[PDB]
From a paper:
The crystal structure of the TgMIF homotrimer has been determined to 1.82 Å, and although it has close structural homology with mammalian MIFs, it has critical differences in the tautomerase active site that account for the different inhibitor sensitivity. TgMIF forms a crystallographic trimer, and each monomer consists of a four-stranded mixed β-sheet and two α-helices stacked against a β-sheet. As a result, the α1 helix in TgMIF is longer than in HsMIF, extending from Pro13 to Leu31. Third, the central pore of the TgMIF trimer is narrower than that of mammalian MIFs with a minimum pore diameter of 3.5 Å at Arg61.
Macrophage migration inhibitory factor (MIF) is a proinflammatory molecule in mammals that, unusually for a cytokine, exhibits tautomerase and oxidoreductase enzymatic activities. Significantly, homologues of MIF have been described in many parasitic species including Plasmodium, Leishmania, Brugia, Clostridium, and Eimeria, and it has been implied that these proteins facilitate the manipulation of the host immune response during infection. We also demonstrate that TgMIF can elicit IL-8 production from human peripheral blood mononuclear cells while also activating ERK MAPK pathways in murine bone marrow-derived macrophages.
Numbering used by the authors:
A (entry chain A), B (entry chain A), C (entry chain A): 1 to 114
The structure:
């Protein structure tokens, strides 16, 4: 699985480390996949707006080979939004999380597809 | 809806503010969705190449729950490309815009899916 | 086609230039599409983790209008992973490459869809 967080907040690598540790656990747990297959990252964007406001907001992209369902997506979004609020100060209601189901052939690690 | 612009141009936050204001309006207008649900951002990439040239270029990703159609995508791309040209100096013919239709269950705000 | 590489490595623009030249050629070759239509970029992320480790890793997103298949994806991933290893020092087995097939109507260049 993959989880990438995009946010204008200038997070210190130590905020980022704690956030990403929370993120990887939540994604592995919800999808029932080994942590060894979970990739997570933080990317500081330039400016971001949401609802016509420059107030802090975030968006996160999560992808998996299967496991993408209404219930599981909601679980992941709840956990990820809460972690961003905790670590970045971004209100959870200003965080969009979107989910993408990938076919095994659409996902490679090194020189091999799944 | 979501619109994220990726470009190597070192845009000043004030270029970015004006760009993103143009972007949010164009996306809301084309999709007939309230501005309150529109998220927009700018991300300065490292190097980008297009057509084998390092000349300035950009790519933008736009996602929505429904509303993704040939006519509507063309309208959004016309408006977004033009805004990047105006605010960033990037020729519109060196801007790729790609569109993604999301199911409601694939999109969360805070701890709730749509 | 589009290929975007996300990695925490602080690559010098000259590492980036060489990487992206390798990337554009490999994508054009595998998909049998003209270089004129290939867009490539590098984005230095903040922190990234993979498998519960902060050791260097990367993820790359590749999109095309058609041409996305198990064999072709594997070819592209092999070439891209190898280039990142060569130019960035990131072990190829710590690189995820994911593939997205786009409809022509979902892809615009300037003010026109494909």
């Amino acid at each position: 699985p993959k989880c990438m967080i995009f946010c204008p907040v200038a997070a210190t690598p130590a905020q980022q480390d704690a956030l990403l540790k929370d993120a990887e656990k939540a994604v592995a747990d919800a999808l029932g996949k080994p942590l060894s297959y979970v990739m997570v990252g933080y990317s500081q964007t330039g400016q971001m707006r949401f609802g016509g406001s420059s107030d802090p907001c975030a968006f996160i992209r999560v992808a998996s080979i299967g496991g993408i369902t209404s219930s599981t997506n909601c679980k992941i979004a709840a956990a990820l939004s809460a972690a961003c609020e905790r670590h970045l100060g971004v209100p959870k209601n200003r965080i969009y999380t979107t989910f993408t189901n990938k076919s095994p052939s659409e996902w490679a690690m090194g020189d091999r597809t799944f």
